[PDB]
Design a protein around this ligand. Structure first.
Ligand SMILES: CCCCCO[C@@H]1O[C@H](CO)[C@@H](O)[C@H](O[C@H]2O[C@H](CO)[C@@H](O)[C@H](O)[C@@H]2O[C@H]2O[C@H](CO)[C@@H](O)[C@H](O)[C@@H]2O)[C@@H]1O
Ligand SMILES: CCCCCO[C@@H]1O[C@H](CO)[C@@H](O)[C@H](O[C@H]2O[C@H](CO)[C@@H](O)[C@H](O)[C@@H]2O[C@H]2O[C@H](CO)[C@@H](O)[C@H](O)[C@@H]2O)[C@@H]1O
Ligand SMILES: [Mg+2]
Lengths: 101, 101
């Protein structure tokens, strides 16, 4: 997994946002960023990777109306139920960029 | 907090990625996306907002060499200490776009 530095360049960190220019699979480049605020955490002074289970335990995501995410998710008893969350709670528009605060 | 809805149009979810087109602080529009793989978590069937204390508890972030992030973070005891993590463990260049996997 990982290894972006092998095929990307001119990276920069700004607060918690990583930005870099990376080789596409066609042969040109693209510049994107990814906010690390929700990818890593601080356990007693040490940075570590924050895991999540959305992608492995939920399926069939959909946008309901303007801002509501609907999906099906596995429960402790190992079935799938329907669940919904309002993305407006914590997803903001910060100057034309979607952010999680 | 959040409320991206009120100033974005054409929002879409695909997989765990949300895309929307949002207004800039003063006209102009930008389309952008955020990968919810790391912002949401399933607890017993329900989509939950995943917290991280990185922003809240660390500072002085910095890229060192080509892939290490360095920062100082508070121990549970409230002291700052420097710490570092290799972004290459899990930051990938996926066809020109940085992803956390
Ligand atoms: C293009 C219309 C020009 C007039 C709008 O002016 C607003 O007034 C304030 C000055 O900054 C500010 O509240 C607004 O910034 C808000 O909305 C713009 C989008 O039009 C954003 O670019 C900016 O980040 C800020 O967004 C926040 O509030 C929004 C709800 O109104 C919400 O949609 C976002 O998630 C942010 O929380 C704007 O400049
Ligand atoms: C002129 C010949 C190039 C033809 C394309 O094939 C390449 O070689 C491999 C095919 O088996 C393949 O691994 C390569 O893919 C990756 O690299 C490109 C950019 O070079 C990315 O766009 C793509 O997402 C994928 O990135 C991954 O590989 C890198 C390690 O090389 C790493 O830096 C990234 O983080 C990803 O792990 C290419 O298609
Ligand atoms: Mg997270």
């Amino acid at each position: 997994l990982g290894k972006f530095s092998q095929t990307c360049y001119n990276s920069a960190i700004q607060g918690s946002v990583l930005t870099s220019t990376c080789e596409r699979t066609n042969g040109g480049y693209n510049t994107s960023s990814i906010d690390l605020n929700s990818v890593i955490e601080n356990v007693d002074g040490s940075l570590k990777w924050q895991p999540s289970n959305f992608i492995e335990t939920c399926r069939n995501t959909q946008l309901a109306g303007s801002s509501e995410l609907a999906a099906e998710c596995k429960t402790r008893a190992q079935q799938f139920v329907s669940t919904k969350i309002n993305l407006d709670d914590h997803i903001a528009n910060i100057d034309g960029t979607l952010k999680y605060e």
